[PDB]
Design a protein around this ligand. Structure first.
Ligand SMILES: *C(=O)[C@@H](NC(=O)/C(=N\OC)c1csc(N)n1)[C@@H]1N=C(C(=O)O)C(=C)CS1
Length: 238
């Protein structure tokens, strides 16, 4: 069941910011859509840095890296030695590009097709297909992927999935944990912003989300997290 959720308030959150966006929520066997541009939920976009979740899974599963490896730029914040988990937190593109080159094109295409992530097209450049195309994915497809990660239902080892989940913890309070990954594809004709993840409630219940919106260069990166938290509170998910 995919349905519009009844929410006047979340539509207004997107409107106030003069942006077009959608929030996709998956619980149990229900997907609900919120926001002011619900047609975005079935629209294909580059995954941008959200692909780091799948890149990490493939690399760990195939023993191209491990969680303790120290990998020795656009942002000064990237200009340092770091682990795969620290690269996840910082969205350090060059670390993920190095991992992708280790995986190589043959393995990468085989794995993305096996998973069926989005359109599953990687083309011929192994180091940037998730940033500039041809790989594209819908917000509904992203919520389904991350819900499977959260439930350890992807077709990877249980330990590898647990290790990637542990890299994704964003916030917690009152026993609720929020896991996820941001992405932003800048310097294109319509900028796309992502925040895809899940809430783990105190009893262990999982509520998955994918926020997908049009970005502007004037916005702070944190607008994605702010809109997500306001929306999740409004829905009583946190
Ligand atoms: C991931 O989305 C990644 N974004 C980029 O590398 C891009 N631009 O940043 C300069 C990009 C991807 S496709 C395109 N045309 N441009 C990182 N994303 C975040 C984030 O929080 O979303 C960052 C911390 C900066 S770079």
């Amino acid at each position: 069941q995919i349905v519009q959720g009844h929410n006047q308030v979340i539509h207004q959150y997107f409107d106030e910011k003069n942006t077009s966006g959608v929030l996709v929520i998956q619980t149990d066997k229900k997907i609900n859509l919120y926001g002011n541009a619900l047609s975005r939920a079935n629209t294909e976009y580059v995954p941008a840095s959200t692909f780091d979740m799948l890149n990490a899974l493939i690399g760990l599963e195939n023993q191209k890296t491990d969680i303790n490896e120290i990998f020795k730029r656009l942002f000064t914040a990237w200009e340092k030695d770091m682990t795969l988990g620290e690269a996840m937190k910082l969205s350090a593109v060059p670390v993920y590009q190095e991992l992708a080159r280790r995986i190589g094109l043959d393995l990468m295409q085989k794995e993305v097709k096996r998973i069926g992530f989005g359109n599953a097209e990687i083309g011929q450049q192994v180091d940037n297909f998730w940033l500039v195309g041809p790989l594209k994915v819908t917000p509904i497809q992203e919520v389904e992927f991350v819900s499977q990660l959260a439930h350890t239902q992807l077709p990877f080892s249980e330990k590898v999935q647990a290790n990637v989940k542990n890299m994704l913890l964003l916030e917690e309070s009152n026993g609720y944990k929020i896991f996820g990954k941001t992405g932003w594809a800048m310097n294109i004709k319509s900028q796309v912003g992502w925040l895809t993840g899940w809430v783990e409630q105190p009893d262990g219940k999982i509520v998955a989300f994918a926020l997908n919106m049009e970005m502007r260069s004037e916005m702070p990166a944190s607008i994605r997290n702010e809109l997500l938290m306001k929306s999740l509170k409004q829905l009583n998910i946190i």
